[PDB]
Design an enzyme around this catalytic site. Structure first.
Site, PDB file in Angstrom:
ATOM      1  N   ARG A   7      11.960  48.356  74.705  1.00  0.00           N
ATOM      2  CA  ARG A   7      10.733  49.153  74.438  1.00  0.00           C
ATOM      3  C   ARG A   7      11.393  50.422  73.900  1.00  0.00           C
ATOM      4  NH1 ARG A   7       7.439  48.091  76.987  1.00  0.00           N
ATOM      5  NH2 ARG A   7       5.963  46.653  76.440  1.00  0.00           N
ATOM      6  N   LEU A  49      11.169  53.682  70.416  1.00  0.00           N
ATOM      7  CA  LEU A  49      10.298  53.934  69.235  1.00  0.00           C
ATOM      8  C   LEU A  49      10.489  52.905  67.990  1.00  0.00           C
ATOM      9  CD1 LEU A  49       8.748  56.627  68.484  1.00  0.00           C
ATOM     10  CD2 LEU A  49      10.815  57.438  67.557  1.00  0.00           C
ATOM     11  N   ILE A 100      21.819  53.257  64.113  1.00  0.00           N
ATOM     12  CA  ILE A 100      20.790  53.874  63.030  1.00  0.00           C
ATOM     13  C   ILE A 100      20.311  52.462  62.247  1.00  0.00           C
ATOM     14  CG2 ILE A 100      20.870  54.761  60.843  1.00  0.00           C
ATOM     15  CD1 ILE A 100      22.652  57.001  61.952  1.00  0.00           C
ATOM     16  N   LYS A 114      21.207  43.377  59.911  1.00  0.00           N
ATOM     17  CA  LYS A 114      22.227  43.128  60.856  1.00  0.00           C
ATOM     18  C   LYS A 114      23.151  42.175  60.584  1.00  0.00           C
ATOM     19  CE  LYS A 114      20.522  46.233  63.824  1.00  0.00           C
ATOM     20  NZ  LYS A 114      21.135  47.728  64.035  1.00  0.00           N
ATOM     21  N   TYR A 138      11.438  39.411  62.341  1.00  0.00           N
ATOM     22  CA  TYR A 138      12.782  40.446  62.261  1.00  0.00           C
ATOM     23  C   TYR A 138      13.121  40.342  60.840  1.00  0.00           C
ATOM     24  CZ  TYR A 138      16.516  43.075  63.849  1.00  0.00           C
ATOM     25  OH  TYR A 138      17.487  44.334  64.342  1.00  0.00           O
ATOM     26  N   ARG A 161      18.414  62.870  61.445  1.00  0.00           N
ATOM     27  CA  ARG A 161      18.000  62.787  60.050  1.00  0.00           C
ATOM     28  C   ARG A 161      17.516  63.963  59.313  1.00  0.00           C
ATOM     29  NH1 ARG A 161      13.623  60.480  57.145  1.00  0.00           N
ATOM     30  NH2 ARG A 161      14.302  59.685  54.949  1.00  0.00           N
TER      31      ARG A 161
HETATM   32  N1  LIG Z   1      14.694  48.643  70.288  1.00  0.00           N
HETATM   33  C1  LIG Z   1      15.252  47.459  70.108  1.00  0.00           C
HETATM   34  O1  LIG Z   1      14.697  46.616  70.933  1.00  0.00           O
HETATM   35  C2  LIG Z   1      16.789  47.192  69.818  1.00  0.00           C
HETATM   36  C3  LIG Z   1      17.329  47.975  69.042  1.00  0.00           C
HETATM   37  N2  LIG Z   1      18.383  47.724  68.402  1.00  0.00           N
HETATM   38  C4  LIG Z   1      19.144  48.588  67.363  1.00  0.00           C
HETATM   39  O2  LIG Z   1      19.496  49.719  68.122  1.00  0.00           O
HETATM   40  C5  LIG Z   1      19.601  50.816  67.188  1.00  0.00           C
HETATM   41  C6  LIG Z   1      18.757  52.076  67.590  1.00  0.00           C
HETATM   42  O3  LIG Z   1      17.616  51.650  68.104  1.00  0.00           O
HETATM   43  P1  LIG Z   1      16.470  52.418  68.843  1.00  0.00           P
HETATM   44  O4  LIG Z   1      15.556  51.328  69.201  1.00  0.00           O
HETATM   45  O5  LIG Z   1      17.378  53.220  69.810  1.00  0.00           O
HETATM   46  O6  LIG Z   1      15.773  53.199  67.440  1.00  0.00           O
HETATM   47  P2  LIG Z   1      15.195  54.668  67.702  1.00  0.00           P
HETATM   48  O7  LIG Z   1      15.135  55.226  69.044  1.00  0.00           O
HETATM   49  O8  LIG Z   1      14.051  54.751  67.100  1.00  0.00           O
HETATM   50  O9  LIG Z   1      16.094  55.683  66.923  1.00  0.00           O
HETATM   51  C7  LIG Z   1      16.274  55.383  65.674  1.00  0.00           C
HETATM   52  C8  LIG Z   1      17.371  56.433  64.895  1.00  0.00           C
HETATM   53  O10 LIG Z   1      17.977  56.028  63.508  1.00  0.00           O
HETATM   54  C9  LIG Z   1      17.717  57.027  62.801  1.00  0.00           C
HETATM   55  N3  LIG Z   1      17.699  57.080  61.377  1.00  0.00           N
HETATM   56  C10 LIG Z   1      16.909  56.190  60.698  1.00  0.00           C
HETATM   57  N4  LIG Z   1      17.075  56.104  59.219  1.00  0.00           N
HETATM   58  C11 LIG Z   1      18.239  57.147  59.085  1.00  0.00           C
HETATM   59  C12 LIG Z   1      18.846  57.630  58.009  1.00  0.00           C
HETATM   60  N5  LIG Z   1      18.585  57.259  56.655  1.00  0.00           N
HETATM   61  N6  LIG Z   1      19.598  58.417  58.328  1.00  0.00           N
HETATM   62  C13 LIG Z   1      19.774  59.057  59.507  1.00  0.00           C
HETATM   63  N7  LIG Z   1      19.394  58.619  60.669  1.00  0.00           N
HETATM   64  C14 LIG Z   1      18.375  57.580  60.427  1.00  0.00           C
HETATM   65  C15 LIG Z   1      16.258  57.810  63.202  1.00  0.00           C
HETATM   66  O11 LIG Z   1      15.898  58.982  62.572  1.00  0.00           O
HETATM   67  C16 LIG Z   1      16.565  57.832  64.713  1.00  0.00           C
HETATM   68  O12 LIG Z   1      17.495  58.884  65.067  1.00  0.00           O
HETATM   69  P3  LIG Z   1      17.502  60.496  64.704  1.00  0.00           P
HETATM   70  O13 LIG Z   1      16.302  60.890  65.509  1.00  0.00           O
HETATM   71  O14 LIG Z   1      18.885  60.837  65.353  1.00  0.00           O
HETATM   72  O15 LIG Z   1      17.616  60.588  63.156  1.00  0.00           O
HETATM   73  C17 LIG Z   1      19.254  50.371  65.993  1.00  0.00           C
HETATM   74  O16 LIG Z   1      20.454  50.198  65.071  1.00  0.00           O
HETATM   75  C18 LIG Z   1      18.459  48.886  66.261  1.00  0.00           C
HETATM   76  O17 LIG Z   1      18.421  48.225  65.328  1.00  0.00           O
HETATM   77  C19 LIG Z   1      19.325  46.580  68.694  1.00  0.00           C
HETATM   78  C20 LIG Z   1      18.746  45.720  69.824  1.00  0.00           C
HETATM   79  C21 LIG Z   1      17.413  45.925  70.532  1.00  0.00           C
HETATM   80  C1  LIG Z   2      13.077  42.992  68.656  1.00  0.00           C
HETATM   81  C2  LIG Z   2      12.701  43.801  67.534  1.00  0.00           C
HETATM   82  C3  LIG Z   2      12.762  44.939  66.893  1.00  0.00           C
HETATM   83  C4  LIG Z   2      13.554  46.044  67.597  1.00  0.00           C
HETATM   84  N1  LIG Z   2      14.911  45.969  66.936  1.00  0.00           N
HETATM   85  C5  LIG Z   2      15.882  45.019  67.157  1.00  0.00           C
HETATM   86  C6  LIG Z   2      15.223  46.549  65.773  1.00  0.00           C
HETATM   87  O1  LIG Z   2      16.311  46.716  65.308  1.00  0.00           O
HETATM   88  C7  LIG Z   2      14.231  47.640  65.290  1.00  0.00           C
HETATM   89  C8  LIG Z   2      14.446  47.948  63.684  1.00  0.00           C
HETATM   90  C9  LIG Z   2      13.436  48.618  63.027  1.00  0.00           C
HETATM   91  C10 LIG Z   2      13.622  49.015  61.599  1.00  0.00           C
HETATM   92  N2  LIG Z   2      13.026  49.734  60.997  1.00  0.00           N
HETATM   93  C11 LIG Z   2      11.607  49.956  61.340  1.00  0.00           C
HETATM   94  C12 LIG Z   2      11.120  49.517  62.847  1.00  0.00           C
HETATM   95  C13 LIG Z   2      12.039  48.965  63.584  1.00  0.00           C
HETATM   96  C14 LIG Z   2      10.039  49.809  63.165  1.00  0.00           C
HETATM   97  C15 LIG Z   2       9.205  51.098  62.438  1.00  0.00           C
HETATM   98  C16 LIG Z   2       9.617  51.043  61.146  1.00  0.00           C
HETATM   99  O2  LIG Z   2       8.751  51.734  60.248  1.00  0.00           O
HETATM  100  N3  LIG Z   2      10.868  50.633  60.771  1.00  0.00           N
HETATM  101  O3  LIG Z   2      12.024  45.138  65.809  1.00  0.00           O
HETATM  102  C17 LIG Z   2      11.425  43.850  65.525  1.00  0.00           C
HETATM  103  C18 LIG Z   2      10.805  43.681  64.345  1.00  0.00           C
HETATM  104  C19 LIG Z   2      10.354  42.358  64.198  1.00  0.00           C
HETATM  105  C20 LIG Z   2      10.658  41.562  65.168  1.00  0.00           C
HETATM  106  C21 LIG Z   2      11.400  41.615  66.306  1.00  0.00           C
HETATM  107  C22 LIG Z   2      11.965  42.977  66.492  1.00  0.00           C
END
Ligand SMILES: NC(=O)C1=CN([C@@H]2O[C@H](COP(=O)(O)OP(=O)(O)OC[C@H]3O[C@@H](n4cnc5c(N)ncnc54)[C@H](O)[C@@H]3OP(=O)(O)O)[C@@H](O)[C@H]2O)C=CC1
Ligand SMILES: Cc1c(CN(C)C(=O)CCc2cnc3c(c2)CCC(=O)N3)oc2ccccc12
Ligand SMILES: NC(=O)C1=CN([C@@H]2O[C@H](COP(=O)(O)OP(=O)(O)OC[C@H]3O[C@@H](n4cnc5c(N)ncnc54)[C@H](O)[C@@H]3OP(=O)(O)O)[C@@H](O)[C@H]2O)C=CC1
Ligand SMILES: NC(=O)C1=CN([C@@H]2O[C@H](COP(=O)(O)OP(=O)(O)OC[C@H]3O[C@@H](n4cnc5c(N)ncnc54)[C@H](O)[C@@H]3OP(=O)(O)O)[C@@H](O)[C@H]2O)C=CC1
Ligand SMILES: NC(=O)C1=CN([C@@H]2O[C@H](COP(=O)(O)OP(=O)(O)OC[C@H]3O[C@@H](n4cnc5c(N)ncnc54)[C@H](O)[C@@H]3OP(=O)(O)O)[C@@H](O)[C@H]2O)C=CC1
Ligand SMILES: Cc1c(CN(C)C(=O)CCc2cnc3c(c2)CCC(=O)N3)oc2ccccc12
Ligand SMILES: Cc1c(CN(C)C(=O)CCc2cnc3c(c2)CCC(=O)N3)oc2ccccc12
Ligand SMILES: Cc1c(CN(C)C(=O)CCc2cnc3c(c2)CCC(=O)N3)oc2ccccc12
Lengths: 256, 256, 256, 256
Positions: free
Chosen positions: B194, B196, B94, B164, B157, B40
Site C-alpha cells: 500500500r 501512493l 519509477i 514491466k 495491471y 520529478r
Molecule cells: N506499490 C506496489 O504495490 C508495488 C510497486 N512496484 C513498483 O515500485 C516502484 C515504485 O512504486 P511506489 O509504489 O513506491 O511508487 P510511489 O511511492 O508513487 O513513487 C512513485 C515515484 O515515481 C516518480 N515518477 C513517475 N513518473 C516520473 C517521471 N516521468 N520522471 C521522474 N519521476 C517519475 C514519481 O514522481 C514518484 O517519485 P518522485 O516523487 O521522486 O518523483 C514502481 O516502479 C512500481 O511499479 C512494484 C511492486 C509493488
Molecule cells: C498491484 C498493483 C499496482 C501497484 N503497482 C505494482 C504498480 O506498479 C503501480 C504502477 C502505477 C503506475 N501509474 C499509475 C498508478 C500506478 C496509479 C496512479 C496513476 O495515476 N498512475 O498497481 C495496479 C494497477 C492495477 C492492478 C494491480 C495493481
C-alpha cells in the site's frame, strides 16, 4: 479437423518469398483457407500480388496498412470486413527497429529508437487485435511472431529484445482480455531464419551454425515449420491454448 | 561486508514515507551510505527534503530530474558527479501509466498511453544507466523495481504489465552490455504494498488478502523488506549476480 | 543487519577447501556465526576437522550423517540439538550420481542410477528440512545448491539435471509447507566452479571458457561469491524471500 | 497434413472413458491412426478392451506393461514391434503417488513415497523412450502429460509436484539425447480434469471453480482438447518443436 476450407485469415508482415509469414500463408493455403494480406507501403503491392499468385487463390485480397497509423489500421480492418466478411484469425509478423540500434551498445539506445521498436513491434498487436476482434464476433485466433531474444539477452538484438519481451507480455494481456470473447492469442518463438530481417545483421551465419551444433534436432528450422505450428494455433486443434509461446526452434529454447 | 559507510547511492522515485524507494533509503542509510535523491517536479522538493531529514544525513543532496527529458537526465547526473563525485549505484523506482489504462480492457489501450508507460517505466532505466555509468568508472550496481504483472497477466495491471515485462528485459540487456564495465543490473519483484501507487486501484485490499491467504509466508511484505534485498543487490554481497529478478513477495511467485 | 554473532548454522556437503559449502562456511564464519558441519563417512572426519581449524571456531562441531539413512539424519539433528541447541538455518550442498550416468546417453540411464540421484540430491533436502525444523521453533532459513542444468538440458549433466529440477521443485514445495512456521527455503544456482564434483567431468575447462566468453561479467564465479549470497539468504536480510532460486553465475542464466 | 492413416501410436495410461489418454486415443483414432494400448495389471484388460471397441479399430492391440518392471517394459515394446512393426510415437499418461502423500505436509514425505512417485511418474518415461526408440528407426514423437504443479507449488500436490518437475526435466534431457535420432519429446501441461486421478483429492471442485473464474477462457478444458494438442505434437505439424511443454489449460498458466 484442420480442414480450413471455410476459414479466412489475415496475414500481416509478408515482405517476400523468404518471409516467415509466407511460410504461414503457404501452409494455411494448402489447408484450404482464404487469405487476406496486408503490406506497409503502396510500393510493395505489385511484388506482393505477384508473389501471392503462387498460392493460386481465386481472389487476391490485399490491403495497405501501416501499423504506425491508427487510421490505417481501423480503416483497413473495416474495409476487410466489408469486402470479405468476418474472419477466423490474424497472423502478425511485423517488427522493426532502426539498424543502428541492432549493433550498438544497448545502453546507448535513443528514446526515439526505443519507442519506435515498441510502437511497431509490440503496440501494433494491441490495435490490430482490437480492430480484428470486430470481425470475429463468434471468436477466433490471433498469433504473433517472437524470438528467444525476448526471453534472454542475445548479443546485438538489443532494442528488439526489449520489444519482443513487450510483445510476449502483450500476448498474455490480450489473451486475458479477449478470452471471454472466445478469441485466443498466442506467440510463436521462431528460431533464426535467413529472411529480409537478417539483412545487415552481422554474424548471422554464426547464429545459424550454433543452432545446428547445439539444438536438440541439430538443424535449423524453416518458414514452413513455423507455418505448420501457426496452422495448429490458428485452428480449433489448439482450442484450449491461449497466452502461450510455442518454440519452433529445433529445441534450442530447452538447452544451455 | 555490508558496511556502506564510504558508498554513495542515487535513489529515484521516492514520493512519500510509504514509497518502496524510501524503505530502500532507510536501510542503506542505516548501513552508513551517503544518499542522493531525485524527484520529478519542483513542487515535490520541500516535502521530500522534510521527509529525508528523518534519515539525519549530514548533507541533503536532491535533484529535479524528469526522466521523460533527455536533457534533465544528462544534466542531473552530470551535476550529481560535480557535487558528490562518483557513485556506487542507483536504485530506480519509477513507473507511470494513465489511470484510465489501469482499469480498462487492455485491448482498448491507446498508442499514446502504451508508449507513455514504456517511456517512463522502461526506457527511463536505459538512459539513467547510460548517464549513471559515467559516475561509475570502477563499476557499480543498478537496481530497478518490478512486479509479478510483468511475468503474468494480472487483472487490471494492463499497460503496466507490458511496461514491466519491457523493464525486466531492459534489465537483462543492460546487464549484458554493462557487465564488462563491472556494472551489475538487477530487478526486485516486490509483492503488493500500500503506497501512493496503489491509490485509485480498485480491489487493492483483495490483492493484499490473496497474498496473506496463499503466499508461503502467509503475510504481505513491506518497504523495508524490499530495502534489505536492495542493500544486498547494491552491495558487493551480490558480486556474482546480474540480470536477475529477485522476488520479495513472501514466496507468492513460487505458488499457483 | 548481517551480524551473525549469535546465530548457528548447520553446513552439509563440505568435502575439501574447494567445496562450495566451504565458501559458505568462510563467509558465515567471518560474519561471526557458530558453525556445525556434517560429513558422510568417518574416513572424512579428520581432514574435515583439519580443514575447519582454518576458521578458528572456538568449538569443533562435526557430525557423521549419511543422508541416505533416515536413522542417521534423525539421530544426527537430534544430537546437534542436544549439543548446541536450536539453530538458525541449514546450508545443503549434497549431490551425487554414478559417474557412468554423467557421460552416457541420458536415455540409457538405469532405474537404480536415476533413483540414486533423486535420493541423495533431492529427497535429502526433504528429510533434512523435516528434522532441522525441530531445531527451529522460532523459524529459520534453509538453502540448497543447484545448477542451471536443472532448468535446461546441458550436455552430459544427464541424470543430475533431472535431480536438480526435482531439488528446485522440492525447494518450492518446502517453502510452501514451512512458510507458516517462519522457515524460508531457497536455492542458489551456482555457475560452474572447479571443485571435487568437477573431477572426471570431461570438457570442464570448455564449460569455464564459455562463461568467461559469454556471461555478462565475462568471468567465472567462485565459492566465496556463492557464500556471500548464502549469507544474504540465511540471514534476515532476505526475510520476504522464499521459494526463490538466485543465480550466482556472472549473469549466465540471463543470456542466450 | 494430419492424415494419420498410415501411422501407429502406443498409448500408455488409459484407465477408463474419462482418462486424458482416452481423449488422445479418440482424436488420433478419428485422424485414422492405428493404436496400441498398454495397461498395468491383467485385471484391467477386459474393461479396457471393451472401452476401446468404441473406437472400432480393426484390430485390438493391448499389452500388459507395469512400468516399474524393466523386464515388462523391454519385453512389451519388443512384442509390440513383432506384432505391429515400427511405430510413429508414444503417448505417456502414467503417474502415481501414495494417497497419503497427496494431502500431507510435504515435509513429512517418506523416502519410499518420494522415490515411488519418481519411479512411476518420471523414470517410466526414460525407459519407455529407450525401448520405444528401437521401434522408431526413422524417428518419431514422444509426448508426456504434466501439470502446472511441476512448475509451481500447488496446495496438496506435494510429492507429485516434485515428480512432475522431474518429468518435465526428463522431457528436455530426452529431447536433447534423442533429437539426433529425429525423435521429438514434448509435454502437455493439462489443466485439471475430473478423471480417476481426481478421486479422493479434496477440494477438487474448488480447483475447477478457480479455473472457470480466473483463466483467460473462463472455462475448464477437457480430454479431447488435450488430445487435439497431442495430435499436433505426435504428427509432423510439430516437426520443429521439441523439449517443449504446451499448456492446454484455458490460459491459466499465463495469469496470476
Ligand atoms: N506499490 C506496489 O504495490 C508495488 C510497486 N512496484 C513498483 O515500485 C516502484 C515504485 O512504486 P511506489 O509504489 O513506491 O511508487 P510511489 O511511492 O508513487 O513513487 C512513485 C515515484 O515515481 C516518480 N515518477 C513517475 N513518473 C516520473 C517521471 N516521468 N520522471 C521522474 N519521476 C517519475 C514519481 O514522481 C514518484 O517519485 P518522485 O516523487 O521522486 O518523483 C514502481 O516502479 C512500481 O511499479 C512494484 C511492486 C509493488
Ligand atoms: C498491484 C498493483 C499496482 C501497484 N503497482 C505494482 C504498480 O506498479 C503501480 C504502477 C502505477 C503506475 N501509474 C499509475 C498508478 C500506478 C496509479 C496512479 C496513476 O495515476 N498512475 O498497481 C495496479 C494497477 C492495477 C492492478 C494491480 C495493481
Ligand atoms: N528472421 C528471423 O530470424 C526471425 C524473425 N522473427 C520475427 O518474425 C517476424 C517477421 O520476420 P521476417 O524475418 O519474416 O521479416 P520480413 O520478411 O522482413 O517481413 C517484415 C514485414 O514487416 C513489415 N513492417 C515493418 N514495419 C511495419 C509497419 N510500421 N507497418 C506495417 N508493416 C511493417 C514489413 O514491411 C514487412 O512486411 P510487408 O512487406 O507486408 O509490409 C518479425 O516479427 C520478426 O521479429 C522471429 C524469429 C526469427
Ligand atoms: N561444482 C560445480 O560446478 C557446481 C556444483 N553445484 C552443486 O553444489 C553442491 C556441492 O558441490 P561441490 O562441487 O562443492 O561438491 P563437493 O566439494 O564434492 O562436495 C560434495 C559433498 O556432498 C557429500 N555427499 C554426497 N553424497 C552424500 C550422501 N549420500 N550423504 C551425505 N553426504 C553426501 C559428499 O560426501 C561431500 O561432502 P562431505 O565430505 O561433507 O560428505 C552440489 O549440490 C552440486 O550439485 C552447483 C553448481 C556448480
Ligand atoms: N486429472 C487431472 O486433473 C490431470 C492429470 N494430469 C496427468 O495426466 C496423466 C494421466 O492422468 P489421468 O487423470 O488420465 O489418470 P487415470 O485416468 O487415472 O489413468 C492413470 C493410468 O496410469 C496407470 N499407471 C499408474 N501406475 C502405473 C505403473 N506403475 N505402470 C503402468 N501403468 C501405471 C494407471 O494404471 C492408469 O492406466 P492403465 O489403466 O492403462 O494402467 C497423469 O500423468 C497425470 O499426472 C495432468 C493434468 C491434469
Ligand atoms: C536473430 C536476429 C534477427 C532476426 N530477428 C529475430 C528479428 O526479429 C529481426 C528484427 C529486425 C527489426 N528491424 C530491423 C531488422 C531486423 C534488420 C533491418 C532493419 O533495418 N531493421 O535480427 C537480429 C539482430 C541482431 C542480432 C540477432 C538477430
Ligand atoms: C557443470 C557440471 C558439474 C558440476 N555440478 C554442477 C554438479 O552438480 C556435479 C554433481 C556430481 C554428482 N555426482 C558425481 C559427480 C558430480 C562427479 C563425481 C561422481 O562420481 N559423481 O558436473 C557435471 C557433469 C556433467 C556435465 C556438466 C557438469
Ligand atoms: C489437480 C490435482 C490432481 C490431478 N493430477 C494433476 C494428477 O497428476 C493426479 C496424480 C495422482 C497420482 N497418484 C494418485 C492420485 C493422483 C489419486 C489416487 C492415488 O491413489 N494416487 O491430483 C491432485 C492431488 C492434490 C492436489 C491437486 C491435484
Amino acid at each position: 479437423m484442420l480442414n480450413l476450407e471455410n476459414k479466412t485469415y489475415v496475414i500481416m508482415g509478408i515482405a517476400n518469398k523468404r518471409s516467415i509469414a509466407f511460410g504461414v500463408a503457404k501452409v494455411l493455403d494448402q489447408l484450404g483457407a482464404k487469405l487476406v494480406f496486408t503490406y506497409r507501403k503502396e510500393r510493395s503491392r505489385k511484388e506482393l500480388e505477384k508473389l501471392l499468385e503462387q498460392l493460386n487463390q481465386p481472389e487476391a485480397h490485399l490491403y495497405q496498412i501501416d501499423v504506425q497509423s491508427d487510421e490505417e489500421v481501423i480503416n483497413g480492418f473495416e474495409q476487410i470486413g466489408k469486402d470479405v466478411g468476418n474472419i477466423d484469425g490474424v497472423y502478425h509478423s511485423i517488427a522493426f527497429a532502426n539498424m543502428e540500434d541492432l549493433r550498438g551498445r544497448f545502453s546507448e539506445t535513443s528514446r526515439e529508437g526505443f519507442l519506435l521498436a515498441q510502437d511497431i513491434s509490440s503496440y501494433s498487436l494491441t490495435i490490430v487485435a482490437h480492430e480484428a476482434k470486430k470481425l470475429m464476433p463468434e471468436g477466433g485466433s490471433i498469433v504473433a511472431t517472437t524470438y528467444l531474444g525476448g526471453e534472454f539477452a542475445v548479443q546485438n538484438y538489443n532494442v528488439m529484445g526489449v520489444a519482443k519481451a513487450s510483445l510476449e507480455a502483450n500476448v498474455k494481456y490480450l489473451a486475458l482480455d479477449l478470452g471471454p470473447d472466445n478469441i485466443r492469442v498466442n506467440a510463436i518463438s521462431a528460431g533464426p531464419i535467413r529472411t529480409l530481417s537478417a539483412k545487415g545483421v552481422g554474424g548471422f551465419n554464426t547464429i545459424l551454425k550454433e543452432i545446428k551444433e547445439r539444438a536438440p534436432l541439430k538443424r535449423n528450422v524453416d518458414q514452413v515449420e513455423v507455418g505448420k505450428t501457426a496452422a495448429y494455433l490458428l485452428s480449433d486443434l489448439s482450442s484450449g491454448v491461449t497466452g502461450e509461446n510455442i518454440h519452433v526452434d529445433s529445441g534450442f529454447h530447452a538447452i544451455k
